[PDB]
Amino acid sequence: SHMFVSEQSLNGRWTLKFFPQPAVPVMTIEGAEAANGIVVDAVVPGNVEIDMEAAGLVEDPMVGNNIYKLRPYEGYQWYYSRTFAAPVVTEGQRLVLHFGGIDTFAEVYVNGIKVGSADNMLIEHDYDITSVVKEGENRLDVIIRSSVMEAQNHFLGTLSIGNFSNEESAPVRRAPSTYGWDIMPRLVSAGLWRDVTLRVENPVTIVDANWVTLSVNPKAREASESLYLQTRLPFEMHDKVKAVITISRDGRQILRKEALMRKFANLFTLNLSGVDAWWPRGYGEPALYTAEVSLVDVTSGKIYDTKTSKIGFRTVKLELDEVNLPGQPGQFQFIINGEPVFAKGTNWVPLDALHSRDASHVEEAVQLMVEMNCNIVRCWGGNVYEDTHFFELCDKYGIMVWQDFAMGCGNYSQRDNFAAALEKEAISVVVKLRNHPSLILWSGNNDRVSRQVLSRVIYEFDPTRPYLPSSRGYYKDPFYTENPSQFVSQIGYHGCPNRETLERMFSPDSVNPWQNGVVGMWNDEWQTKANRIYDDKFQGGRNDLMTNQVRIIFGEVPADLDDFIFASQSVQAEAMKFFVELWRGRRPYRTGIIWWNIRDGWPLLSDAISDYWGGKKQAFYYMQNVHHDVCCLINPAANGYMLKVDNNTLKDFEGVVEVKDVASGKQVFKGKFVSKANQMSEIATLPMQKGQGMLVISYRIEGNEYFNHYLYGEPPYKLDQYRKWVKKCGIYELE
């Protein structure tokens, strides 16, 4: 009832002073104030380019070639400053200054006294400022250095040079994609990109509450849950404090346990009844339960601290296939609550190049995966680690999370200084995320980094989850169809974004892609949205993937912009849909497919199926119809085709299915089928049809009508005849 702890936000308006970084970087408050620079208003959480654009000092980086105009600020320093009132601290309490995100190399001062030196963009930074804080008004100053210039303080190994990830990224703990990628612009940025708060703690406080599902019995509605509790506990308070442990759901108390605190750290085991297991989408309900622990004085009832979260009773195992194709990647399958689950989902890339806006995108971005019905998502190591709320949403909606540690495409230093920086980061992120039921896998894609540093962290701080040391042309080419990986990471096909997105990110004279009307030659602004990392004038490159892919499927590249959008999105839609159906149709050998990708992190031309502004490409709806719990699909056979139905649930379903020709209306097949639980079931073999065309699949399950299709024949097709088949099928609108 009575609250003896509190958290006061330091978010809001700050003062931001920026200037070019001298040869000797500015480290002190006196140097930052004596330096000659520009002072503007800043918003925390934020990025400095946001503050600068609000002051009219930079142009919108999302339009045209404006991204290259931010180049000089990579060599700048950034000085945050504000005042704050210190909260009332009683005798023994501790005041903690909390940073959710400092980007990156910065000296932190409170009342002119240094309290910390941050050097990791991806993790939290907490400082005990109890003794340095004064009565009344206090000063908080953060002086950030240039991340790019920090790289030259290090001598690189041979393996760290020439990778797709930037050499500037190798010796520093930052998201590698911020230096530029083929799917993200170069925007190093800086600033306080997550919350800054002031926490008041009691001498008796919870240091960590670690919930672990030892076992789960779904049929009996039981589970065994362990609580690893670490606290600060003055010895005078030993035997005078009790832990109050509650499992509840919507106010209704499931279990209550109280235990006297005779030592600072304890293991409490809870044997629960009447509790449902946590399942990913399709395989059941994502049952969640409020788990709460409080440190309570046994005499006065004083609540010294309380930790509350929603946990899910679930076990996860990575069943390795060590018989078939030893050494091949993807020879494994996820086992959730003892059931082998078929994984299907997207790779997760940055939500925004200015990551202070990540949090405002996460609700609608997770809703993309919910509408798609992904049961898994892989957080790519090129991005930052997402915050707690992303994993809360994945807990709530039953989306399993595969978490890469933040590494780019390359090899890294084997020396002690880098190993210590990565270990501190790994321990921080693991302790923070290890209680979310949606998280199922750590990945660190011999190397000391992947085979020793990260493995020792998972071994000591998360024994409950598996760890993995390591991770164009025609879509029916043998490079795709002959891949024997059970669990594949699909490469992705390009898709020209919607017209409204093109007209929003390109200048009016650059909306049309063809330079001087020459089909195949991209203008300079389209080359920038390749993404082109550096401002280098050249022709061709990554954008030629759009034309070469429509030239294989449709023979010729349309000159009209609207017809080019249809051709490009159609190739992307057919390719990605074909890859999902190919893996779902070849179960039980195939065990999962994680495709690239569902959402852009910036207005760009990419292989994502939905752009930065929420513009869904045609591939999104194609993929949606092949991601259902029960899906009737058609795989190519040696002679003819094979109508199949795949089931990613633990329940049996029945229904009827009808396969017809879209152009002639003739019935190729129509029969009743039994879709057995958690397996692929072949229905019937279909003969080869004459020439090109399309087949329409119409199946009915439990009074619900679902629709699919299959494009038969060999390319090249005629773009206008394919358009007629889409309209005559009645499933997907043209545009």
Add this chain to the structure above:
Amino acid sequence: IIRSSVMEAQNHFLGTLSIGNFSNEESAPVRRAPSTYGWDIMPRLVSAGLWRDVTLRVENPVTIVDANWVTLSVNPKAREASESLYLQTRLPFEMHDKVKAVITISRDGRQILRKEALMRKFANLFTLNLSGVDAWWPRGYGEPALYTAEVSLVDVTSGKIYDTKTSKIGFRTVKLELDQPGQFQFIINGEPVFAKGTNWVPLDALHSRDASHVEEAVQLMVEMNCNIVRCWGGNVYEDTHFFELCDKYGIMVWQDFAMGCGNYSQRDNFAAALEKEAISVVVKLRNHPSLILWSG
């Protein structure tokens, strides 16, 4: 000025494996005897204090840092053995070529060997091929023959003795012949011995009284006729006198490093504290013939 051991534990963040074991979470990040926090066979009595000797030592510029005696080979029927002396010293350079090591093996006044060697460097290996020496055996398999091994540093001209190290060694070889836990056998001087003995637990919850119990407690093993004793990792390491008695009565010693009943930290901080401890205890005890096994 001693601090609270229990409270020191809260200066550390424990890994999952260190929580919930039978050994106390307070024991996991500190280098103390785990049984002092309580056990099923020992009371909780954390205690504190200067529980062993406090002395002032005066050393000369020339001094012996370590005298490490190693038995390379033994031939009991021929009454021979090859003994190595690994000698480390502090030696000013002006004292190089001016000091000699005097190595003497003796048994009850009878001198077995007297070798003198000019000190030309600070560390040296002296091989001693001995005659008329009996091998060291555990109880039942023969005599626990011990010899006084003495090394002294002596000025060549003035004859002044700068330092002297003296202990009783035994000429013995130990091999662990492997063949499921416990699939091994101790080979002592080439013979396969059948081991029979007890585990060794704290002599007292107040460990400053261990030294007053060790004579009678070892006599329990002599009356019992144990030929082996396993010093439990829940206890402190026994002092030199315990191993002196085990040398004398022919009781082999299997020594656990001081670990509780659970997994420990994997971070560099704990590894550095444990390495320092292990180097200290190994150098202190590696010269006793009774000691035959280290266990982690």
Add this chain to the structure above:
Amino acid sequence: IIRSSVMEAQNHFLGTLSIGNFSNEESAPVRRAPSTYGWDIMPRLVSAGLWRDVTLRVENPVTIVDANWVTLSVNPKAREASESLYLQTRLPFEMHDKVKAVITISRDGRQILRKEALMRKFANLFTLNLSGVDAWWPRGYGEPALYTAEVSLVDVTSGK
């Protein structure tokens, strides 16, 4: 001011496997040539002093930290080769996009290959596909063909 190398060895407690070897115990904990303490083919002469050149060097803010040449592949029959240059430089941020790297492979004054690239970052990997070059062979197996490889950091505006 140089100290005694011999006396430095007594700052270290030696392990058992470091005592009794052919090399001196004084050699085990120090980073010196072990033969200086004596061997069966070299006398004992510890010595001391500044035994190699001492120089004062002046470096520009734009300077080459390391030029690492690596032969990926070679085809001696076709007189072709693939050479990589792992270049690490010191580069103030003001000089980013204003300096170019100039790479020249030559032999006895005749130029074989030349490549220019704008320095956009401090470290770079350059790939050179070379024609008309001979492979390096040990004695007997061919000629020890060498080529002068030069890299320079050049101001794109003034040519300095």
